[PDB]
Amino acid sequence: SHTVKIYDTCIGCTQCVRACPTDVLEMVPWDGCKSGQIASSPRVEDCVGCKRCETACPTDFLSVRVYLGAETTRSLGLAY
Amino acid sequence: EMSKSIPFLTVPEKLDGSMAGDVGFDPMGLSDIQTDLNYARWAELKHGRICMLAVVGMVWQEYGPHLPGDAYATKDPWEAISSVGFASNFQTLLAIGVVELANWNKYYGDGTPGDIGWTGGQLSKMNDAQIKTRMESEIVHCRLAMIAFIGATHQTFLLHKGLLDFSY
Amino acid sequence: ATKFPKFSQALAQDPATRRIWYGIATAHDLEAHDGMTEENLYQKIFASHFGHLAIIFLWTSGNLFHVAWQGNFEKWVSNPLKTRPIAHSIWDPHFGESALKAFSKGNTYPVNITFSGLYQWWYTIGFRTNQELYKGSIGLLLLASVLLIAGWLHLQPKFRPSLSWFKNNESRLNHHLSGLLGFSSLAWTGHLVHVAIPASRGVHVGWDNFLTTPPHPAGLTPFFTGNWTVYAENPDSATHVFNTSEGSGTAILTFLGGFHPQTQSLWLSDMAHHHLAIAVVFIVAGHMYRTNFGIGHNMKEILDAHRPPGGRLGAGHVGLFETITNSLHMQLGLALACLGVATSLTAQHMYALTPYAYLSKDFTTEAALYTHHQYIAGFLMVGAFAHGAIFFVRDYDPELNKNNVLARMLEHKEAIISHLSWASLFLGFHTLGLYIHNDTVVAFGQPEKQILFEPLFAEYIQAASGKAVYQFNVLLASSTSPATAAGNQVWLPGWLEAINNPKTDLFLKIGPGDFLVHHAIALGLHVTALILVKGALDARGSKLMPDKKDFGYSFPCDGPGRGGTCDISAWDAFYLAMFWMLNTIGWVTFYWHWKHMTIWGGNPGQFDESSNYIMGWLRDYLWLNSSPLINGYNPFGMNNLSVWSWMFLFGHLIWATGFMFLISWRGYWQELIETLVWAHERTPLANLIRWRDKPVALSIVQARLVGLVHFSVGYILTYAAFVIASTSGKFA
Amino acid sequence: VDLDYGMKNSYVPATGGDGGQGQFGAQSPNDWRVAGTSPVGETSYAGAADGGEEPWFAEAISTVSLDLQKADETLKAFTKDAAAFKIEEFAAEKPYGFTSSDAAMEELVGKLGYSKFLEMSTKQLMKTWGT
Amino acid sequence: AASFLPSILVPLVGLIFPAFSMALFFLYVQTDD
Amino acid sequence: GLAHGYFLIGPFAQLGPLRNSDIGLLAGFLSTIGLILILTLGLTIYGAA
Amino acid sequence: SVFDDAVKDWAEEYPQFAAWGWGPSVQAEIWNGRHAMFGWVVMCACAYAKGHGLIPDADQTLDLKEWGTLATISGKNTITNERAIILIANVHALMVGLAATISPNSFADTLLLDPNHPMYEWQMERNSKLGGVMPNLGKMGVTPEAELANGRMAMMGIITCIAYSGIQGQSMIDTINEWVGGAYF
């Protein structure tokens, strides 16, 4: 459904993965930052488009960007 | 390279002598933008064939035996339309329409331009060359008729005199 | 796709009702459809244009047909100033007997009176009988069919035009300027000389005798001999009665200037000369570009060479040629802008220089036409800026336009926006302030303390063209001026008569009241522009969203973070500007109507004194002139203004309904819809029936659009009723 | 367990503007667009639940559930690869008297259950498997 | 007579036509090619 | 159908445009038939989809 | 001209409708023909009544008060009793047709070809062998063939009547009377 992309400016603060309401983001090993960790979006099929993740990023400009797109039952948050 | 008809101009590429009546005449270059000259050839033939009949008819109606009955006597070719009436004209129009719509695919297709099957027994038992000769004759006559139609009509409305009236 | 939006898999695979809503509103954005090549795009657009043309012709055909079959054109022709023009008949099964009588007043059957001005136009151009109108309608129906055939033909495989053909600018411009505009004008002067002018003088020239009825006694001899002056001799006398030979002349091309004394409209001979001159100008201009004949200009070269040597404009216009040719949005924007200016000009010049006979005496029609074109102009203007923004987001190439005149505009964007803001503030504070000062002092009973500035600059311009009331002895208002001497024997005689006649709309008299309203209109234009311009410049990015270009022209928002990013897309600028556009056009239209209303009523003073403060507008204009409308239907009966009365209230409803979508947002509604779903699934009997498209609330942008449409439709409808019922109810 | 059951759906990702099937598929294999309620003694949604004497509220009769025993299997299957990576690393770090990966797994998971095994660092594992 | 046309066409244009058109659109948007 | 048709003639017959006319009941019947046709169209379309 | 090709092209251009039997199809030819045959009876009856003055109180307009604005032709002018009666007769017939369309039997010829109707196969077969330019004799009597032949005849007659009426500048009723020998009037 929606598209979430992570950029090299990430600092591995883990704040984004701790804010997702649907477990779409994970922290994976990396060497480009001091923390030695980067964020990934393995399960974008469950993204609802809340953008809470973006609100949590501390980088000058979001290192995590959510681009809204095709809509499915899951993305539209339909319990019915 | 140089047109045969106009010796001081370059001949357009599509005019290669393949089709009948190709004297290399296309000064304004209307052949380049067209994918092929098939549709144009259909039109040339259709326009010419109609004009042939028209010129003959005009002369006959002015100087010839009319059909029995009033309203079918006016010699003036233009007045004839109104005189004869809507009914007569409509019936002809509908007939022409049927033929036109029936051969629609032919007109917009890739067959021999101008051939709708009304070849009589002619154009048969003859070699390709002879066939081309016949086709060339038709196109020449078509072009002549079209020029004549313009002249006849213009003379009628400008000089206001019968076609065969030659007075100076 | 395999669902409704065949052009979009994304929408097609949507499990909700959005699939249907969006598919309808994304249908004509051919550029974004799945699998679209540039060649196909152009070809489909070309065909679509043929269809639009056909619709326009069918529309015109209908007007002629209905007027001819159910109208009173011939009677009107006989007594133009005592007959009300009929548009079409009415067959409503819901009408009551009383209504049938009311709407059938003056005639024998229920009918609608036209306020479109077609009768005057047709009368002027030569139409005199209903049979003539019929022929026209039939012809246009045929032309419409021909256009439809063309659309199909050029979508066929062997007739689809190439992408190169679509981008040959030189040939198209040459042809369009010389043939579409130039030769067409020449053809029109032919009609005017052959059919119209003869009719005005009582002679019938039709398809039956046009080839034998010479337009001028001399013939075409003077034309080829060079003695063109002959065609301007013997102009119609000042005692000429229109549509008759009494006092007629023989002139066909003249420069008399002014209006026909009896019809109070521009002379036909002058119009013929006008179109002839315009024709030559355009035909000559159409020979400027190179089109496979050697001679001509190449547009790219012209643009590239124009760079001011000083360097004040950077690299100049280099790079713009490719940008325009490869962007349909910029082309559309340029077109809409120019057409918008044209529409406003038509409205402004048509009420002053009346072109059609007895149109000035039809107050309601005159009012409708002005408001009609001015509103259309506003929409056309806003669209231009909208497509300009779409261009920046979609088709702008930063590299191609390096240091170009266009790029440098986006470099000082802040300067432009900030200064436009200041202008808006200055105009706003003082205009409102002065109005309120005048209101307060008047309310306290001291009108002598009002701040009223005379519009001296405008008054000067009027005087410069000949007006004498202001007493500014300048230019054409001066007998000793070199200018007066020049045209005193050419066109001034007639002009100086009309400009100095109080019963004409040529340069109406202005006073302190006009000063203020003009400054209000200025505020509107500036503020509307600010919104639109900002949207365009800040469409590719901003400090809040430096990556806006990657999201598009229209997106809901960017989240509740970074402070909140609602209405941050460029589409939202269009959304916000629409409201201001309506407001400004409203002010403009109100001004025209009230001023004219008082003039027509014979009390120009009311506007002159009450227009200085706001209460005047509300009480002496909106309140006073609403009495006929609100009494279309009352507890005691009804009249022909009932339909207009009902529509007025209808408009208010739609307008207010719009507010719901504008103020209430999605969250609330979505939750409510969820409850309704539960109910349907749990209620016996109805459970049998179920939906195939999950019911969901309207989207953020969708609601904005729906709301704007409701607001707009109500706005236009309500005023339409007022302008018509008020004018007709009082003066008709 | 068919780990691809969800991925095997009718959804077809679009070109641009779609994240894709992700990790567990974007949509259910089954279509939600089924019919409504039916008369007594009849069924509508294919393998639907008979409403008995109250067909009107048949949709409220659950037929889809989770077996606790089966739940264990799905946990193991979907986390098989992770377990493999974990044990592999443990093996790489010179295990004391190592035997076979599988054997080690059983021993290491016999203790520390399975969930705990998945959440333990190789270092902790080696310490645990010192014996 | 042409005069009867208003009473024969208006019922069709304002009632029959719109209905069938809406029905067709529904069938078109509810179909899965 | 038998159930729904019987109660629908009432509203039209007693409150319709031609209620006070001698042909009011006849008009009411015609109106009901019209409504039934509309509802039937709906049923047909629903089934198809 | 081959007929078949044109029909095929129509199906291609408008496939959805063609599926049900709409358009240039045998089904349509049969149904439209049946209606035309039936109409001839109606038109002849109308002529007879007009000539023999059977219609009660014709040439009089219905009351705008008893009936409503729905009965108005222009303004307060109302429809004549004759036209009203003719329409009611047709409405009686249309009602029967609507019932047959909406509630078909299990052994009836449905208007449209429905795969879920039991008569689909028979209809498909009958239509498949009922096409030709010339009426196929040898199948006289009550056969599908006879029905189609007579239907085409009736439809042609309608066209001819309208044309003749126009050419002779007369009402269709008059032409009918003339072709019968002036019996009705």
Ligand code: CLA
């Ligand atoms: C362009 C072709 C054309 C057209 C449009 C007309 C039109 C007309 N002609 Mg005319 N005519 C034509 C050619 C044409 N003519 C030719 C070629 C001749 C010489 C044979 C005549 C000889 C002629 C006479 C003697 C009379 C007319 C008359 C008339 C008028 C009444 C119609 C009529 O009786 O026609 C009569 C038509 C014919 C006698 C034969 C027409 C020949 C046709 C074109 C042969 C082509 C058929 C085509 C190939 C196959 C069918 C086409 C398709 C529809 C199936 C009408 C204005 C009458 C008149 O004066 O009205 C006032 C009249 O008395 N025409």
Ligand code: CLA
């Ligand atoms: C096939 C075409 C054709 C033919 C045969 C004619 C024939 C005729 N036209 Mg005509 N005309 C035509 C086309 C045609 N026109 C066109 C297209 C128009 C413009 C719309 C006109 C406009 C027109 C007008 C306005 C007038 C004529 C007139 C005439 C007549 C006297 C012409 C004359 O004095 O020429 C004399 C020729 C010359 C002075 C020049 C000499 C000819 C050159 C040098 C060489 C000719 C050889 C050439 C191969 C011609 C052979 C073709 C032909 C024999 C088939 C004559 C019957 C006049 C008339 O009174 O008729 C009633 C007249 O007033 N026509």
Ligand code: CLA
């Ligand atoms: C020649 C003129 C012209 C042309 C060819 C286009 C063409 C286009 N415009 Mg554009 N536009 C124009 C004028 C034009 N516009 C004007 C004058 C404005 C100012 C208002 C705009 C404002 C505008 C915006 C803001 C947008 C476009 C967009 C578009 C593109 C898609 C259009 C679309 O999706 O509609 C699909 C079809 C519809 C939307 C149906 C329209 C239904 C309307 C809104 C309601 C009708 C009124 C109401 C029902 C009346 C009932 C009242 C009754 C009760 C009395 C397309 C390329 C869109 C785009 O993204 O392009 C990139 C876009 O966002 N245009």
Ligand code: CLA
């Ligand atoms: C009555 C309704 C109303 C009013 C008064 C305004 C007023 C304003 N809008 Mg606005 N707007 C409205 C409705 C209104 N809006 C609606 C419904 C919409 C939806 C489309 C918008 C959308 C909109 C946009 C999108 C924009 C504006 C902008 C503006 C400002 C333009 C500059 C200006 O006029 O400065 C003068 C302002 C005023 C005169 C209004 C305030 C007056 C107070 C009372 C101060 C008066 C002081 C007085 C003169 C004495 C001062 C001295 C004293 C202290 C002693 C102005 C504040 C633009 C902006 O931001 O400005 C640059 C802008 O971009 N508006």
Ligand code: CLA
């Ligand atoms: C151009 C469209 C149009 C037309 C021609 C009519 C015509 C009529 N409306 Mg009306 N209406 C319309 C649009 C239209 N409406 C719209 C858009 C609305 C919504 C605001 C309404 C809301 C409305 C109401 C609320 C009422 C009417 C009523 C009436 C009838 C009053 C006259 C009379 O004699 O009643 C007496 C009635 C008769 C003599 C019966 C006539 C026979 C009926 C109409 C046959 C209908 C069968 C029809 C073919 C079924 C449709 C099939 C479907 C596939 C389209 C008249 C038939 C009144 C009425 O009585 O309704 C019937 C009424 O109460 N209308």
Ligand code: CLA
């Ligand atoms: C919503 C309020 C409302 C009401 C009650 C009415 C009432 C009426 N209108 Mg009116 N009308 C309204 C709004 C309303 N109008 C609006 C907003 C407009 C503008 C578009 C019109 C325009 C209009 C026109 C143009 C005409 C009428 C006409 C009529 C009359 C005909 C009634 C009819 O045919 O209905 C038919 C009703 C039904 C078929 C169903 C009724 C609903 C049932 C009874 C509900 C049953 C529920 C049930 C109890 C649930 C429990 C069941 C359980 C116990 C088993 C009637 C007096 C006509 C007339 O003659 O005027 C007097 C007429 O010509 N109306």
Ligand SMILES: CC(=O)O[C@H]1CC(C)(C)C(=C=C/C(C)=C/C=C/C(C)=C/C=C/C=C(C)/C=C\C=C(/C)C(=O)C[C@@]23O[C@]2(C)C[C@@H](O)CC3(C)C)[C@](C)(O)C1
């Ligand atoms: C009462 C009674 O019995 O007395 C009778 C006696 C009498 C004397 C007979 C009467 C008469 C006169 C009558 C009946 C006259 C009938 C006249 C009639 C019927 C006249 C023209 C048809 C015209 C055609 C077909 C023209 C052009 C057809 C043309 C020009 C085509 O080109 C066809 C075309 O195919 C080409 C060839 C090539 C194709 O690529 C393109 C197309 C398809 C376009 C009376 C007095 O009225 C009444």
Ligand SMILES: CC(=O)O[C@H]1CC(C)(C)C(=C=C/C(C)=C/C=C\C(C)=C/C=C\C=C(C)\C=C\C=C(/C)C(=O)C[C@@]23O[C@]2(C)C[C@@H](O)CC3(C)C)[C@](C)(O)C1
């Ligand atoms: C940016 C722009 O727009 O530039 C454009 C402008 C413009 C004008 C369009 C251009 C052009 C074309 C040209 C050549 C324009 C030049 C001049 C123009 C406008 C036209 C040509 C000749 C007229 C002649 C020869 C006069 C015949 C006139 C004659 C023979 C007579 O005087 C007859 C007459 O004498 C008798 C026999 C007796 C007298 O009692 C009566 C008179 C005196 C009337 C340009 C220059 O190319 C580019």
Ligand SMILES: CC1=C(C#C/C(C)=C/C=C/C(C)=C/C=C/C=C(C)/C=C/C=C(C)/C=C/[C@@]23O[C@]2(C)C[C@@H](O)CC3(C)C)C(C)(C)C[C@H](O)C1
């Ligand atoms: C152009 C073209 C072709 C063609 C063609 C042609 C010739 C096409 C012409 C087709 C043509 C002409 C078809 C007539 C229909 C008449 C009908 C349907 C009458 C219905 C009549 C009915 C339903 C009767 C109704 C009434 O009973 C009711 C309803 C009430 C009664 O009160 C009164 C009446 C009796 C009136 C080619 C050559 C074949 C192929 C080519 O490729 C394309």
Ligand SMILES: CC1=C(/C=C/C(C)=C/C=C/C(C)=C/C=C/C=C(C)/C=C/C=C(C)/C=C/C2=C(C)CCCC2(C)C)C(C)(C)CCC1
């Ligand atoms: C967004 C955008 C866009 C758009 C833009 C626009 C929309 C613009 C507009 C503009 C405009 C809208 C302008 C206007 C102008 C005007 C003018 C320029 C005027 C002038 C004037 C003059 C020059 C003068 C005149 C005169 C004369 C002639 C004589 C004397 C008097 C006087 C005054 C009158 C585009 C698409 C391009 C793209 C980019 C971006």
Ligand SMILES: CC1=C(C/C=C(\C)CCC[C@H](C)CCC[C@H](C)CCCC(C)C)C(=O)c2ccccc2C1=O
């Ligand atoms: C009322 C309201 C709704 C709900 C409004 C709805 C659901 C409109 C429903 C009625 C319209 C007229 C659609 C009904 C269409 C018919 C069911 C027929 C459809 C036939 C199809 C073939 C098109 C919102 O979704 C919403 C969203 C965001 C901000 C404000 C609002 C808001 O104010």
Ligand code: SF4
């Ligand atoms: S937008 Fe919401 S669901 Fe998507 S990754 Fe961010 S927090 Fe998770």
Ligand code: SF4
């Ligand atoms: S919040 Fe931003 S910086 Fe921190 S881990 Fe997530 S993407 Fe990286």
Ligand code: SF4
């Ligand atoms: S549109 Fe919604 S998410 Fe975006 S800023 Fe506004 S409230 Fe927040």
